[PDB]
Each structure stands twice: as structure tokens, then as C-alpha cells.
Write a protein that binds this ligand. Structure first.
Ligand code: FAD
Ligand code: FAD
Ligand code: NA
Ligand code: NA
Lengths: 115, 115
């Protein structure tokens, strides 16, 4: 009932993916070498500080197995979608369809249901 | 009505402050020099990538005037609260009472209304 309270593991995850997917959606289609490096470092630093040491450590192992592809907006948005799907799978959640990431996180559904 | 849609400026801000205030709340009381540097860089990289170039640029100017104090959890949580209050003030919102940051973003209100 109270709005207004510290977020739990789930509520923080939901905020975090919204922040992550949204930053990804507006990342350049042709980023400079510096921007590519800055985004890889950003994702790295995010995994260092994400609290709940059960979620961050799993995440750092996952990122060690699978480095952020920050080459282009296309590559980075799909990479992040596939990353997020590994966590969905681990938690018994269904795969999100990565072809929809632009509609979900930038443009809105092509049927206009976000209008 | 649809849940489920790309976040607007306001919804993204609300997610972003929740992510920022929550990362701050669990930052060490005695962070290593490396962690202090990693958090300052984290905040910097966040302002580089925050989308909507009207909000990010204002933010980068604000951070140029006012460097993240990442010395301790106490210092960093209060600094971030004061940062957020500058944005509240700019938008005609009232000041949030920074003594409440722990209750709001870590522990819950001492009256137990988050229980
Ligand atoms: C980096 C990270 C690591 C985490 N690790 C763990 C963990 O180890 N264990 C744990 O219990 N929880 C972890 N969480 C929390 C967890 O992933 C969820 O956020 C939480 O369980 C709530 O799930 P949900 O059903 O609300 O949807 P979420 O998984 O929060 O997703 C939010 C929304 O994003 C959209 N979406 C779903 N998948 C994708 C995708 N692949 N690409 C783009 N958009 C998508 C859907 O619209 C969905 O409603 C983590 C969260 C973060 C951001
Ligand atoms: C880095 C950043 C920069 C932004 N810059 C702009 C901008 O230039 N122009 C613009 O129109 N919008 C900007 N926004 C969006 C804006 O700050 C708000 O997020 C949005 O207007 C929604 O406001 P709100 O009333 O939902 O509460 P928000 O400001 O989103 O706050 C969310 C919650 O945090 C708590 N809170 C409020 N203040 C503090 C505090 N000082 N310390 C700790 N907790 C607090 C309150 O419980 C509040 O309900 C920015 C957001 C981010 C994160
Ligand atoms: Na998930
Ligand atoms: Na604000």
C-alpha cells in the first residue's frame, strides 16, 4: 500500500532493466570508439555496484562469459535483450522476443496500443 | 492503459532515481579508493548516456559545478539527495528531506508503514 518504500529485489530489477533497455535504445547507431568503450565500462561498473550480492555475482560471471557488444545500437540493444533473457530463463520466465526491443523500449508497438 | 510501453521522460526519471538512490544506499561506509573512483566514473558515464539531450546536458553542467562525493556511503547518499533536490527545485517540486534517504531507500520508514 505505501508507494514510497525501498524497492525489493523485483521492483529494483524492473527499474534497472527499464533504465538499461532505455539507455540502449538511444545509444548511437555509429558510436565513436570512445562511446563504445564508455558503454562497456558503464555496464561493467553497473555490475560492480548492483546490490544484492547473489544477483551481482551471477551477473559478473555472466558478463565474463559474454562481453557487452557495444559496436552499434543494433548490436548493443540485441545483446542486452539476450542478456536479460538469460536471467528470465534462469528464473523460469519465458524468452522476450528480441525483435520487439525497439517497439518495447523506443518506438512503441506498431499497432499503436501505446498511443 | 498499456503497461508495457516505452517510458516517457517522467517514468524514466522515476526509474533512474530509484536505481541511483538504491545503488547509493548499499555503497560501502568505507569504500576502497578504487570503489570511490569506480562510483565517480559510474555517475559520470550515467550522465553521458542518459537520453533526452535537454536533461543530460543540464545534468553534466550540474555535475561540473558539483562533483560526486563518493568518499563514504553517508557522503554519497547525501550528495545524491542534494543533486536530486536541485532538479526538484528547477521543476517547481518541493525539497525532499535528505535526513530521510535511509528510510526511503534502504530501511523503510521507522513507523513501519513499509511493513
Ligand atoms: C542486471 C540484473 C540482474 C538480475 N539478476 C537477478 C537474479 O540473479 N535473480 C533474481 O531473482 N532476479 C534478478 N534480477 C531481477 C529480475 O531480473 C527481475 O527484474 C524481477 O524478477 C522482476 O521480473 P519481471 O517479471 O517484473 O520482469 P523483468 O525481468 O524485470 O522485466 C521487465 C520488463 O522488461 C521486458 N523484458 C523482459 N525481457 C526482456 C528482454 N530480454 N529484453 C528487453 N526487454 C525485456 C518485459 O516487458 C518486462 O515486463 C536482476 C535484474 C537486473 C536488472
Ligand atoms: C539524472 C536525472 C536528471 C533529470 N533531469 C531532468 C530535467 O532536466 N528536466 C526534467 O523535466 N526532468 C528531469 N528528470 C526527470 C525528473 O527528475 C523526474 O524524475 C520526473 O519529473 C518525475 O518526477 P516525480 O515527481 O515522479 O519524482 P522524482 O523526481 O522522479 O523522484 C522519485 C521519488 O524519489 C524520492 N525523492 C524525491 N527527491 C529525492 C531526493 N532529493 N533524494 C532522495 N529521494 C528523493 C521521492 O519519493 C520521489 O517520489 C531527470 C531525472 C534523472 C534521474
Ligand atoms: Na528477469
Ligand atoms: Na525531480
Amino acid at each position: 500500500f505505501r508507494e514510497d518504500c525501498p524497492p525489493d529485489r523485483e521492483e529494483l530489477g524492473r527499474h534497472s532493466w527499464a533504465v538499461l533497455h532505455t539507455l540502449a535504445a538511444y545509444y548511437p547507431d555509429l558510436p565513436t570508439p570512445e562511446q563504445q568503450q564508455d558503454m562497456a565500462q558503464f555496464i561493467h561498473l553497473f555490475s560492480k555496484f548492483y546490490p544484492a550480492e547473489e544477483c551481482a555475482e551471477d551477473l559478473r560471471k555472466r558478463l565474463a562469459r559474454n562481453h557487452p557488444d557495444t559496436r552499434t545500437r543494433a548490436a548493443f540493444t540485441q545483446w542486452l535483450c539476450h542478456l536479460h533473457n538469460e536471467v528470465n530463463r534462469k528464473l523460469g520466465k519465458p524468452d522476450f522476443d528480441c525483435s520487439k526491443v525497439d517497439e518495447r523500449w523506443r518506438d512503441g508497438w506498431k499497432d499503436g496500443s501505446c498511443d
